[PDB]
Design a protein around this nucleic acid. Structure first.
Lengths: 164, 362, 183, 166
RNA sequence: UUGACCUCAAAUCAGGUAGGACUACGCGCUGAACAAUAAGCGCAGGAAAAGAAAAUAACCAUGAUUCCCUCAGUAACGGUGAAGCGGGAAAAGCUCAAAUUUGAAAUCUGGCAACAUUUCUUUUGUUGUCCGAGUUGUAAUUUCAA
RNA sequence: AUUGGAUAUGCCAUAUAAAGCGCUUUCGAAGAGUCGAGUUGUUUGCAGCUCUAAAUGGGUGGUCAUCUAA
């Protein structure tokens, strides 16, 4: 069959090498688990129950409403869109919104892989907003790779009706 | 067809289907509990292959072993899930809370009285003794091997304290010890300490399950024997002595012809299997000494002249002393089996070894 | 197949190892030389492809031509210097008398007629070591523990132990604990 | 948010993206049953504003009805009969073609504790809401019987009211 | 490969729930004859339905719904036939979707273990722990009167 | 005997919290196969069919007033 360009673009995903390097940075910024969050909070509870100021946390941003709001605020440095969202119209505007806001974006494979980073079964989109000073060069190198391996590549292919 | 001998016996596939358990799980349940194949008189009529009574299958339907096995398998899958997802903390925490099982109900059902368990502990004692010297492998468990060795040491200490040992025979396979506990006769075989190798031909899963059941039965028997005799179950074990290969010296028997060699101080050098010689001497009420090479914690030393008999299988004794004439383990084994002290001169070092008569042979 | 990043990683390790050997040899020719132990147990932890030629030669001399190979050696200045050179790929510790006896009883195998044969019987040991006054496994274990004159001959006759499945460097008495996990 | 984009994309129903998805999914829905369970709504914006929450006790069901009474009213009633233990909350249009009109019906389990302990949907547990679609109490049912406020929308005029003093 | 996710099934698996009856009043659907007519079919409750204006008005303005009186046998229509105002009875208001919690899913069902509680040994919860749901969105916050 | 709403009072109270009012050199999202148009039937409403939207927009009234549906 013949597919529109806005849906055809999801068949051109990021390559295996760049995606593997992307998830190396993502796995450094996983949100703390429900168990790790409870352990941290109970530890501060004992310091309050007996008797007694931190830094801002660092983690990857997830959630469709949350990430779209971060792109519109230009707070996202890298947006990774799942390639197999069951209703495709959930993320069918995200590549266009990321183009309009100047957000480096990529379409990665296995929405399940995105969910594993955030200790969830499934994530439609992940977004890295701001990382530690140690990983500034690692994120910068990834953004340059996404520019070449995803934006410089395809591009002319994403404006063509796929299938048929 | 649908009644009579056909319903009398249940095929292995039919029994597994009724119990809804896999072949490996059914074998483990049959080994852990009491279940044996029962060939019907009319095999053709019984088939309307292995045959088992429907009463055993009916009892095994409500057995918690199958449910526990599923819980272990289900928990193992969840542990694998956590490792793959990358959350190491979840897998590590779930490892501590992993499922376990208890054999107290099975032991009581299989052995309603301690007499039945003691009479059936001959195989358990032999299995524990055989596994006490086997090398640690992937199929076997290091903790299980240590537990089996500790159980064997506790049983030997209890037998020595109670002087329940009756006969000791030296066989090619190993040392056969016959003891009478609570009237029941228990026979165990202790293999010699040699550089053996795994045959790689028997089923390790079945052997491990049998060893685990044997260890549980041995532990329950040891606890009952210690309580009856007033000993503390489990006996205190010294870590430093255990690391020094002290043998039974580490296991302290703290309280919570039985004198054939009582008036004798036997000494052993580093040329004979002192592991069995010390147990036989201890069971006889005598004093047994070992060389520092064989182990630490020896009450006596080689230079001590208080030793009446010096056990040494070597053909030459350069440092032979006075009052400690060399004797052979065959004389000690013959004396223990017959209950009368043998001739030390006949079994002296450098002399022909007299034939060893098997006490079990009548 | 092999990815490009793998070859660079192997190269970086090779350059990393080259500097480390340069550290130990030049201007740092001092070894720890642990005392209170005349015998030590050295086990090759692991090795990588295209390993340094000096490390391979030391492993060949120390009979550590394969990974997870355990060999007992006598404490000496030359042995300590060789151990320091091959420290990254070899773990050393102080064996115990009980551990040595257990290892000989479980995985004790000698080299008879150029072949690794287990010492399941004392007849083979007596024939192989007739001139060394060794006739049983206990005598060989006692000589190794006491580090006698014939211990070097016994070590040559005895094949290297295979303690297949650890930290790197000196482990001390904790190496004997690993022996319990292997035998 | 993303429901602003989803709901403005749902107004261009014959655009390239929407037309391709309408024809692809219409074929897929025809291979399924007449009434089949939906794992998640095909219009998460439209279900969300009609009272659907992604939580236990909320169920989405798809149903196709033949074109050619109100089509949406019959979809609510047929699904309500199919799932007799659930309460029909609302319903909406998801797709159509030359023959079939496809609808998704939001149902709520009045016996689930997550429904009975939630004050915002606690009202549907009361027996007065048994088969709301059957009595014309849903959104399309109310619209069908011309219920509303204004001039755009019997018994008290066919009777003689005789007082005591007259 | 292991292994996650999505499916598709299965279980005499655990916990639930629907049917039928009544039907004076109530709410839908359907329908002839001599009119939302009887019937026919569907579905509730102690009331139901309706209900907090995409409502009237043209005033000095009114203010959810329902019922009564009046408007009125009037306008309009072609004999049918309302409604606004006005007078009474009663009065109560609110909840979501659409906002980034993002300095921390803060939310929820269930299993299990204790502790309570009872129209009640029958009822209904609390606390702890584990699992699941949930980021394709559960809480707090907001509903234009703001 | 079983209960309801208050009163009085003991204890507990996770308040580092949560509200109303007031003020602004900062903001303010509002429901679509619907509205609507054509046409065909049932009794203006409703229903089918064809088509199918907007953003001070849309509805209903007399440029203005009023309301804020799906």
């Amino acid at each position: 069959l013949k597919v529109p360009p806005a849906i055809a673009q999801f068949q051109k995903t990021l390559d295996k090498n760049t995606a593997t390097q992307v998830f190396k940075l993502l796995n450094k910024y996983r949100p703390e688990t429900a168990a790790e969050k409870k352990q941290r909070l109970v530890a501060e509870a004992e310091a309050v129950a007996n008797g007694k100021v931190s830094k801002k946390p660092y983690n990857v941003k997830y959630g469709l409403n949350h990430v779209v709001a971060l792109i519109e605020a230009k707070k996202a440095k890298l947006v990774l869109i799942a390639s197999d969202v069951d209703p495709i119209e959930l993320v069918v505007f995200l590549p266009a919104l990321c183009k309009k806001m100047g957000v480096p974006y990529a379409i990665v494979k296995n929405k399940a892989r995105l969910g594993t980073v955030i200790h969830q079964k499934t994530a439609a989109v992940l977004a890295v907003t701001e990382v530690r000073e140690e990983d500034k060069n690692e994120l910068a190198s990834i953004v340059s790779a996404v520019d070449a391996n995803f934006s410089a590549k395809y591009d002319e292919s994403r404006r063509k009706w796929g299938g048929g | 067809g649908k009644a009579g001998a056909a319903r009398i016996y249940i095929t292995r596939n039919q029994a597994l289907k009724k119990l809804q358990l896999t072949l490996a799980d059914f074998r483990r349940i049959c080994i852990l509990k009491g279940v044996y194949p029962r060939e019907p008189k009319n095999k053709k009529k019984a088939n309307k292959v292995t045959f088992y009574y429907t009463k055993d299958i009916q009892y095994l339907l409500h057995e918690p072993i199958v449910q526990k096995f599923r819980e272990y398998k289900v928990f193992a899958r969840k542990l694998s899930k956590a490792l793959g997802k990358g959350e190491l903390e979840t897998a590590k925490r779930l490892e501590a809370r992993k499922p376990t099982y208890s054999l107290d109900h099975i032991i009581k059902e299989r052995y309603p009285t301690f007499h039945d368990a003691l009479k059936d502990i001959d195989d358990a004692l032999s299995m524990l003794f055989l596994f006490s010297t086997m090398p640690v492998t992937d199929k076997i468990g290091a903790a299980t091997v240590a537990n089996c060795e500790r159980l064997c040491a506790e049983f030997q200490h209890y037998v020595i304290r109670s002087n329940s040992l009756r006969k000791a025979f030296l066989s090619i396979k190993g040392i056969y010890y016959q003891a009478e506990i609570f009237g029941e006769q228990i026979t165990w075989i202790v293999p010699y300490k040699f550089a053996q190798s795994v045959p790689t031909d028997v089923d390790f899963r079945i052997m491990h399950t049998f060893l685990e059941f044997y260890q549980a039965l041995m532990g329950f028997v040891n606890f009952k024997l210690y309580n009856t005799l007033g000993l503390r179950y489990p006996p205190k074990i010294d870590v430093a002595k255990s690391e020094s290969a002290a043998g039974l010296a580490a296991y302290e028997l703290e309280e919570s012809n039985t004198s054939l060699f009582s008036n004798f101080t036997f000494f052993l050098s580093r040329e004979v299997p002192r592991f069995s010689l010390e147990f036989v001497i201890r069971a006889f009420g005598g004093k047994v000494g070992w060389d520092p090479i064989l182990g630490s914690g020896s009450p006596f030393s080689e230079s001590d002249p208080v030793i009446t008999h010096h056990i040494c299988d070597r053909p030459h004794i350069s440092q032979k002393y006075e009052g400690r004439i060399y004797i052979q383990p065959q004389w000690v084994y013959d004396s223990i089996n017959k209950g009368i002290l043998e001739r030390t001169d006949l079994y002296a070092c450098g002399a022909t070894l007299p034939p060893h008569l098997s006490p079990f042979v009548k | 197949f092999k990815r490009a990043e793998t070859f660079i990683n192997n190269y970086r390790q090779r350059e990393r190892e080259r500097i480390r050997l340069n550290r130990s040899a030049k201007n740092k020719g001092d070894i720890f030389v642990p005392d209170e132990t005349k015998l030590l147990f050295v086990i090759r932890i692991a090795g990588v492809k295209n390993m340094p030629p000096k490390i391979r030669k030391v492993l060949r001399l120390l009979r550590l031509s394969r990974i997870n190979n355990a060999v007992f050696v006598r404490n000496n200045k030359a042995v300590a210097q060789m151990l320091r050179i091959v420290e990254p790929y070899v773990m050393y510790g102080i064996p115990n008398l009980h551990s040595v006896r257990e290892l000989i009883y479980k995985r004790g195998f000698g080299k008879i007629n150029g072949q690794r044969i287990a010492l399941s019987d004392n007849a083979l040991i007596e024939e192989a070591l007739g001139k060394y006054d060794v006739i049983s496994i206990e005598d060989i274990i006692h000589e190794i523990y006491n580090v006698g004159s014939h211990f070097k001959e016994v070590t040559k006759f005895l094949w290297p132990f295979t303690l297949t499945p650890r930290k790197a460097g000196y482990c001390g008495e904790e190496i004997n604990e690993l022996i319990k996990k292997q035998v | 948010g993303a429901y602003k984009y989803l709901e403005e994309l749902a107004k261009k129903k014959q655009s390239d993206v929407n037309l391709f998805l309408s024809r692809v999914r219409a074929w897929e829905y025809r291979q399924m049953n007449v009434i089949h369970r939906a794992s998640r709504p095909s219009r998460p914006d439209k279900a969300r504003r009609l009272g659907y929450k992604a939580k236990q006790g909320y169920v989405i069901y798809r149903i196709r009805v033949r074109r050619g009474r109100s089509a949406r009213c019959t979809a609510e009633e047929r699904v309500g009969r199919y799932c007799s233990n659930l309460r029909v909350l609302n319903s909406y249009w998801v797709n159509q073609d030359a023959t079939y009109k496809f609808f998704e019906v939001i149902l709520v389990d009045p016996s689930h504790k997550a429904i009975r302990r939630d004050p915002r949907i606690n009202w549907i547990v009361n027996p007065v809401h048994k088969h709301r679609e059957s009595r014309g109490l849903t959104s399309i049912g109310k619209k069908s019987r011309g219920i509303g406020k204004g001039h755009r929308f019997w018994l008290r005029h066919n009777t003689l009211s005789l007082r005591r003093y007259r």
